[PDB]
Amino acid sequence: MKLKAIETFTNDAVGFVRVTTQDGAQGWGQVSTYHADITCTVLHRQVAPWMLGQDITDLDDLLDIVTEREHKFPGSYLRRAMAGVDTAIWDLRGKQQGKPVAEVLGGTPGLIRAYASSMKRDITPRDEAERLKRLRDTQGFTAFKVRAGAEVGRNRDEWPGRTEEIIPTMRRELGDDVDLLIDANSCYTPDRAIEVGHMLQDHGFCHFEEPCPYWELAQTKQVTDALDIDVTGGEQDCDLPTWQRMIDMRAVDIVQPDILYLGGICRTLRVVEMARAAGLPVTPHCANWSLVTLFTMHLLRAIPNAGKYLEFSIEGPDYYPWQEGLFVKTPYEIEDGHARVTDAPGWGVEISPEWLARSQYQSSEI
Amino acid sequence: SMKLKAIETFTNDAVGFVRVTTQDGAQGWGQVSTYHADITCTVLHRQVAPWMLGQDITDLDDLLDIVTEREHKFPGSYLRRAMAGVDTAIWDLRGKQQGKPVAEVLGGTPGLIRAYASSMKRDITPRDEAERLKRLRDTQGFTAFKVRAGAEVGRNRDEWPGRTEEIIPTMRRELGDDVDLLIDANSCYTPDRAIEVGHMLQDHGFCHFEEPCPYWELAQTKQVTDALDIDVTGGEQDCDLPTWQRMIDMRAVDIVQPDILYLGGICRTLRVVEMARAAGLPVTPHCANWSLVTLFTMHLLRAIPNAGKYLEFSIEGPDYYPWQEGLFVKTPYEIEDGHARVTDAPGWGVEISPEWLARSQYQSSEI
Ligand SMILES: [Cl-]
Ligand SMILES: [Cl-]
Ligand SMILES: [Mg+2]
Ligand SMILES: [Mg+2]
Ligand SMILES: [Mg+2]
Ligand SMILES: [Mg+2]
């Protein structure tokens, strides 16, 4: 229908969005995490003005108008902001139809296999394998991702030999009955990445993520065509034209869009379409317990070319202190290695009234 | 001293200035890109200052790369708009430390730069547009003029039926045969429609066709460039260096037009200038208002080896840019027979208005 108001409730780490249509119906979404306060300022300054009082039936076209009206601001922030209104609108639709978003998207509620994703690089290989082994046995995870090199470390490792050690260590401690994934986070050059690539293949890994600087498509494509193991990437890509370019030249084997970094469900679905047309699987990026993971769970239960599993961060409050207490009831309980999309209308989650009380509020209305 | 001790911003919603201070106490003034400058300044302190404070600014290029790598999850305009403010303040500091205008620090010399009168309006009839530009031709001495075609990112639609068809011959008729005529479509057309418009431009001697197609569709722009004889230009919204490399490598345009502040500063703009230089392409930067962006461009144009034909010079008044009034103690934009001037004053050679600063929103970061 038509939007009458857009409100944001945020702190520096995460911000939630509530949209209200003319008839009074409301929906809840979330902008991308990290510097969420800046993102919400951008939302009211450059997104709300173009969406308020407009028909949201053709959301794709409306979001395009936003980016065209703000064409002088290509990049992350505008899209992180857009994602908040988009996701709130989908929650609205689900609640209006009495269906979870997965169903509105043409899918069905149910379980989704998840892979335990480690975010740490400072942690020692021994301690990593140890905590992931406990999760394998207590939570039922059958897929695990660890870190390689140093974050955008210009070919330098977290420390001499960490990557060499962590590769075999993980396969040794977790056994041969689990899937192993690794993420270099744009640390290596095509050649250094190829070196590491072989060490990975020798130990059974099946996922080599962001081996080279993500903005250097060519370098990445060199690794992808040089290795047999799957090379993946795309989490930092929020530009659709660049997405099409990446998929046409096939710089990767698996595409990994982040629903919120990309600009919402609608825009992510465009990448999903580009991916299937090229016959590529979609394994989204979602690295924390904000709503980004839940949004991805609904998406994976609806798209025809979904990857093998849902990225599920296994970090605690020491890494993500801000994600504690966000919801009345967490939607992230794991059941034998799987997450669950329930039949609750919309996203099926409630933002903590206490968290909202402490948030910074801002509204845009017509 | 070459180590930053502090970074301060003075801003309002339209424009924000940056002052940097080295450990020895030396200071330089720069500016972040205009428009939602308050947000840009917030981004500057949150995502730029933390990586630059306390560091040696001798190799500013590498330091700026570190900023983009540390903030790799934030590709896009805002981070670069913020970085541009620290970068330009550092160049002012260097010029002042050396007693030289930035143009000289960059390897160039002070002097005149030919400017082209740039109209920003589409909601102005071809008749009134020609009239005001003709008067500027006679009173200011401009010999180059740029007007607008189509509707801004108008999806092939014109501001109104037939406006572009009328404005082309009107400018040539009214301004005469002895002036250069440029036009900017601001991403309005599809390649086919742009080519039709291109033919009209060529039929009336225009020499510059800017941003004919959506700027993010390099292949579309290239099709136009390849089909038309008239120079096709673009690049003002491009802040990504690898995209710049792709655009130049594929020869999508005939003239590159980086905006010093949208691109992230002088250092980063110089990287694009070099890409263009090696490829044999000229550089005609974008600078659309009387904030410091135009002055920064003036200094750059007095130094690069592959400069284009002229400096973009906005001729809009306070009805269009109310916020650019009273920014400086003395305007650096007085025109002399169609030319702007870079003086030998150290640094940028300008002083921010104390009154404007008094009314600004202040924020500082220091170590
Ligand atoms: Cl941005
Ligand atoms: Cl860049
Ligand atoms: Mg990753
Ligand atoms: Mg391969
Ligand atoms: Mg232009
Ligand atoms: Mg040509």
Total count of domains within chain B = 2
Ligand that lies nearest to the alpha carbon of residue A73, given by its number in the listed order:
1
Partner A contacted by B42 (CB < 8 A): yes
Q: What angle do CA B307, B313, B317 make, to 5 degrees?
A: 170
**3-state SS, residue B312:** strand
Q: Considering only alpha carbons, which residue of chain B is nearest residue A39?
A: B39
Same domain flag for A202 and A53: no
**3-state SS, residue B82:** helix
Partner B contacted by A41 (CB < 8 A): yes
Does B210 appear as a known binding residue? yes
Same domain flag for A248 and A364: no
The CA–CA distances, whole Å, from B43 to A204, A293, B59, B229 equal 43, 26, 22, 42
Torsion (CA) B293, B261, B256, B106 in degrees, nearest 10:
70
Same domain flag for A308 and A285: yes
Same domain flag for B90 and B204: no
**3-state SS, residue B129:** helix
The amino acid at A211: P
Q: Considering only alpha carbons, which residue of chain A is nearest residue B67?
A: A152
Same domain flag for A207 and A291: yes
Question: In this structure, are residues A189 and A163 in contact, taking their beta carbons and an 8 Å threshold?
Answer: no
Other Cβ atoms closer than 10 A to A361: 11
Question: In this structure, are residues B303 and B103 in contact, taking their beta carbons and an 8 Å threshold?
Answer: yes
Q: How far is the CA of B269 from the centre of ligand 6 (A)?
A: 24
Same domain flag for B361 and B269: no
Q: Smallest Cα–Cα separation from A74: which of A238, A268, A245, A258?
A: A238
Are the Cβ atoms of A73 and B78 closer than 8 angstroms? Answer: yes
Does A342 appear as a known binding residue? no
Q: Considering only alpha carbons, which residue of chain A is nearest residue B245?
A: A216
Query: What is the C-alpha to C-alpha distance for residues A299 and A303, in angstroms, rounded to an integer?
Result: 6
- State the nearest Cα–Cα gap between B186 and chain A, in angstroms: 10
* Per-residue H/E/C for chain A: CEEEEEEEEECCCCEEEEEEECCCCEEEEECCCCCHHHHHHHHHHHHHHHHCCCECCCHHHHHHHHHHHCCCCCEHHHHHHHHHHHHHHHHHHHHHHCCEHHHHCCCCCEEEEEEEECCCCCCCHHHHHHHHHHHHHHHCCCEEEEECCCCCCCCCCCCCCHHHHHHHHHHHHHCCCCEEEEECCCCCCHHHHHHHHHHHHHCCCCEEECCCCCCCHHHHHHHHHHCCCCEEECCCCCCHHHHHHHHHHCCCCEECCCHHHHCCHHHHHHHHHHHHHCCCCECCCCCCCCCHHHHHHHHHCCCCCECCCEEEECCCCCCCHHHCCCECCCCCCCECCEEEECCCCECCCCECHHHHHHCEEEEEEC
Q: Considering only alpha carbons, which residue of chain A is nearest residue B259?
A: A72
Mention every residue, 6+ apart, whose C-beta is less than 8 A from residue A180. A143, A144, A145, A146, A170, A171, A174, A203, A204, A205, A206, A207
Are the Cβ atoms of B242 and A215 closer than 8 angstroms? Answer: yes
Is the four-CA dihedral A67, A68, A74, A77 of positive or negative sign?
Answer: negative
Burial B92-125 (b: 16+ CB within 10 A, else e): bbbbbbeebbbbbbbebebeebbbbbbbbebebe
Q: Smallest Cα–Cα separation from B29: which of B18, B40, B42?
A: B18
Does A224 appear as a known binding residue? yes
Query: What is the C-alpha to C-alpha distance for residues B304 and B282, in angstroms, rounded to an integer?
Result: 10
The pair of structure tokens assigned to A208 is 């080599």
The CA–CA distances, whole Å, from B21 to B3, B270, B321 equal 9, 24, 30
> What backbone phi and psi angles, to 5 degrees, belong to B101?
-70, 155
Same domain flag for B159 and B269: yes
Does A158 appear as a known binding residue? no
Task: Look up tokens 């951008």; give the residue.
Answer: A42
Question: In this structure, are residues A10 and A36 in contact, taking their beta carbons and an 8 Å threshold?
Answer: yes
Q: Which residues in chain A touch residue B74, judged by CB atoms under 8 angstroms apart?
A: 35, 75-77
**3-state SS, residue B59:** coil
Task: Look up tokens 């994934």; give the residue.
Answer: A181
Task: Look up tokens 């210009």; give the residue.
Answer: A154
Q: How far is the CA of B267 from the centre of ligand 2 (A)?
A: 12
The CA–CA distances, whole Å, from B217 to A261, B189, B225 equal 21, 11, 13
**3-state SS, residue B107:** coil
In the DSSP assignment, the letter for residue B23 is T
The pair of structure tokens assigned to B37 is 């400058």
Q: What is the CATH number of the domain that holds B22?
A: 3.30.390.10
Query: What is the C-alpha to C-alpha distance for residues B286 and B84, in angstroms, rounded to an integer?
Result: 15
> What backbone phi and psi angles, to 5 degrees, belong to A116?
-65, 120
In the DSSP assignment, the letter for residue B365 is E
The amino acid at B228: L
For residue A74, give the nearest of B46, B72, B77 by CB distance: B77
The pair of structure tokens assigned to B162 is 């037939």
Q: Smallest Cα–Cα separation from A181: which of A124, A118, A227, A126?
A: A118
Query: What is the C-alpha to C-alpha distance for residues B340 and B246, in angstroms, rounded to an integer?
Result: 33
Same domain flag for A174 and A118: yes
Distance of CA A64 to the CA centre of its chain: 21
Are the Cβ atoms of A152 and B42 closer than 8 angstroms? Answer: no
Strand partners of residue B115: B311
Ligand that lies nearest to the alpha carbon of residue A151, given by its number in the listed order:
3
The amino acid at B246: R
Dump strand ranges (E) for chain B: 4-11, 16-22, 27-31, 111-118, 144-148, 180-184, 208-210, 232-234, 255-256, 311-314, 339-342, 361-366
Burial of B25: CB neighbours in 10 Å, binned 0-12, 13-18, 19+: exposed
Are the Cβ atoms of B217 and A72 closer than 8 angstroms? Answer: no
**3-state SS, residue B35:** coil
Ligand that lies nearest to the alpha carbon of residue A224, given by its number in the listed order:
4
In the DSSP assignment, the letter for residue B113 is E
Q: Smallest Cα–Cα separation from A312: which of A141, A134, A123?
A: A141
Query: What is the C-alpha to C-alpha distance for residues A67 and A56, in angstroms, rounded to an integer?
Result: 15
Surrounding ion ligand 1 within 5 Å at CB are A 75-77; B 76-78
A71, HSE (Cβ side, Cα atoms, 13 Å): 20
> What backbone phi and psi angles, to 5 degrees, belong to B202?
-60, -35
Is the four-CA dihedral B40, B42, B43, B48 of positive or negative sign?
Answer: positive
Q: What is the CATH number of the domain that holds B146?
A: 3.20.20.120
How many residues are there in chain B?
367
Question: In this structure, are residues A365 and A11 in contact, taking their beta carbons and an 8 Å threshold?
Answer: no
Documented resolution in Å: 1.9
Q: How far is the CA of A39 from the centre of ligand 3 (A)?
A: 22
Ligand that lies nearest to the alpha carbon of residue A230, given by its number in the listed order:
4
Chain A and chain B share a number of CB contacts under 8 A equal to 74
The CA–CA distances, whole Å, from B271 to A193, B85, B96, B276, B283 equal 27, 17, 23, 9, 12
Q: What is the span of the domain harbouring residue A146? A: 99-352
Query: What is the C-alpha to C-alpha distance for residues B242 and A314, in angstroms, rounded to an integer?
Result: 34
Burial of A55: CB neighbours in 10 Å, binned 0-12, 13-18, 19+: exposed
For residue A75, give the nearest of B39, B42, B77 by CB distance: B77
Query: What is the C-alpha to C-alpha distance for residues B153 and A233, in angstroms, rounded to an integer?
Result: 31
Same domain flag for A283 and A358: no
B363, HSE (Cβ side, Cα atoms, 13 Å): 17
Q: How far is the CA of A256 from the centre of ligand 3 (A)?
A: 8
Does B93 appear as a known binding residue? no
Q: Which residues in chain A touch residue B215, judged by CB atoms under 8 angstroms apart?
A: 71
Partner B contacted by A361 (CB < 8 A): no
Task: Look up tokens 């020491």; give the residue.
Answer: A318
The pair of structure tokens assigned to B195 is 């080519």
Query: What is the C-alpha to C-alpha distance for residues B19 and B3, in angstroms, rounded to an integer?
Result: 14
Q: Which residues in chain A touch residue B155, judged by CB atoms under 8 angstroms apart?
A: 68
Query: What is the C-alpha to C-alpha distance for residues A256 and A214, in angstroms, rounded to an integer?
Result: 12
Query: What is the C-alpha to C-alpha distance for residues B134 and B176, in angstroms, rounded to an integer?
Result: 9
Q: How far is the CA of B184 from the centre of ligand 1 (A)?
A: 25
The amino acid at A30: Q
Same domain flag for A155 and A304: yes
**3-state SS, residue B139:** helix
Q: Give the DSSP letter string of B274-299.
A: HHHHHHT--B-----STTTHHHHHHH
- State the nearest Cα–Cα gap between B46 and chain A, in angstroms: 8
Terminal alpha carbon distance of chain B: 15
Test mutation, B47, B156, B216, B286, chain A, max A CBs within 10 A:
B216
Burial of A91: CB neighbours in 10 Å, binned 0-12, 13-18, 19+: buried
The CA–CA distances, whole Å, from B358 to A125, B28, B131, B236, B292 equal 55, 18, 39, 32, 18
Same domain flag for B3 and B74: yes
Question: In this structure, are residues A217 and A249 in contact, taking their beta carbons and an 8 Å threshold?
Answer: yes
Partner B contacted by A238 (CB < 8 A): yes
Question: In this structure, are residues B96 and B347 in contact, taking their beta carbons and an 8 Å threshold?
Answer: yes
Q: How far is the CA of A80 from the centre of ligand 1 (A)?
A: 9
Partner A contacted by B333 (CB < 8 A): no
Q: Smallest Cα–Cα separation from A102: which of A255, A296, A277?
A: A296
Mention every residue, 6+ apart, whose C-beta is less than 8 A from residue B162. none
Surrounding ion ligand 3 within 5 Å at CB are A 183, 209
Same domain flag for B195 and B206: yes
Mention every residue, 6+ apart, whose C-beta is less than 8 A from residue A295. A30, A87, A101, A259, A260, A265, A286, A347
The CA–CA distances, whole Å, from B194 to A67, A341, B123 equal 22, 49, 20
- State the nearest Cα–Cα gap between B79 and chain A, in angstroms: 9
